[PDB]
């Protein structure tokens, strides 16, 4: 995360780290939505242009972590993947539209002070909170800049949702209704963005109606990290919620 700041302990208990087993490597961010399910971007599991094509066994996740340069014993938990579910309409052969995926854990992780599920947006939350100017929070362990350069503690930054027309004119890349963008405009004085290693992580919002945290997006893509005139794009979680619920109910 570029231009972010250290996160407080227990500030994002649903944060999940997706690791490639060997060579050991932090691949993406992810979120805990239940004791057996983890949400993340599909391009993190399947993206041939980067010769990225993972199967359950190549991967692993760590939950409840705060600092990489330390093993928080009895705190952090590791979980193996039982099954990967990539959104059916996700087509890497273009746009990265519907960039969402689920991961069923082999064994249910135990909730605690540092590990806790986040909520999926109900229609009210989406209707009222998904508006230009409203800020959401992006968290992760990705790079600190577009160039060590890797944080030791979970990073966090708050960014404003941008008007669709501004997102549209900010890139030659065709964008869809399943994506929304966030970031400060050039000359808003403020900066901050997600960077390589943050993809798949959550973009959350705190409901002022019931004080609960809701995941509205999933860090999906961008052209560079924190460049003026450019914005980060996120998977519109609400629009794809029926698929999420389908998978969890049916399995």
């Amino acid at each position: 995360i570029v231009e972010g700041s250290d996160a407080e302990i227990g500030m994002s208990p649903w944060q999940v780290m997706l690791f490639r087993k060997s060579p050991q490597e932090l691949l993406c961010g992810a979120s805990l939505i239940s004791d057996r399910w983890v949400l993340t971007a599909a391009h993190c599991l399947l993206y041939p242009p980067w010769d990225k094509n993972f199967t359950e066994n190549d991967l692993l996740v760590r939950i409840g972590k705060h600092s990489r340069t330390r093993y928080e014993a009895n705190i952090e938990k590791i979980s193996m993947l039982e099954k990967i579910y990539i959104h059916p309409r996700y087509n890497w052969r273009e746009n990265l539209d519907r960039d969402i995926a689920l991961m069923k854990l082999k064994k249910p992780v135990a909730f605690s002070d540092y590990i806790h599920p986040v909520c999926l947006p109900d229609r009210e939350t989406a209707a009222s909170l998904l508006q230009a100017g409203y800020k959401g929070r992006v968290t992760g362990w990705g790079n600190l800049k577009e160039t060590k350069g890797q944080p030791s503690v979970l990073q966090v930054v708050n960014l404003p949702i941008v008007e669709r027309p501004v997102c549209k004119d900010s890139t030659r890349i065709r964008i869809t209704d399943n994506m929304f963008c966030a970031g400060y405009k050039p000359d808003e004085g403020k900066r901050g963005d997600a960077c390589e290693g943050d993809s798949g992580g959550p973009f959350v919002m705190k409901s002022p109606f019931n004080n609960r945290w809701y995941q509205m997006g999933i860090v999906s893509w961008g052209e560079g990290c924190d460049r003026d005139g450019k914005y980060g794009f996120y998977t519109h979680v609400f629009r794809l919620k029926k698929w999420i619920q389908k998978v969890i109910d049916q399995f």
């Binding site: 989406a126 209707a127 997102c167 698929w243």
Partner: peptide, 14 residues
């Protein structure tokens, strides 16, 4: 920018 309309999974509209 976002809507409260869901992305379709089909073929089988209104």
């Amino acid at each position: 920018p976002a809507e409260t309309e869901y992305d379709s999974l089909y073929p089988e509209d209104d």
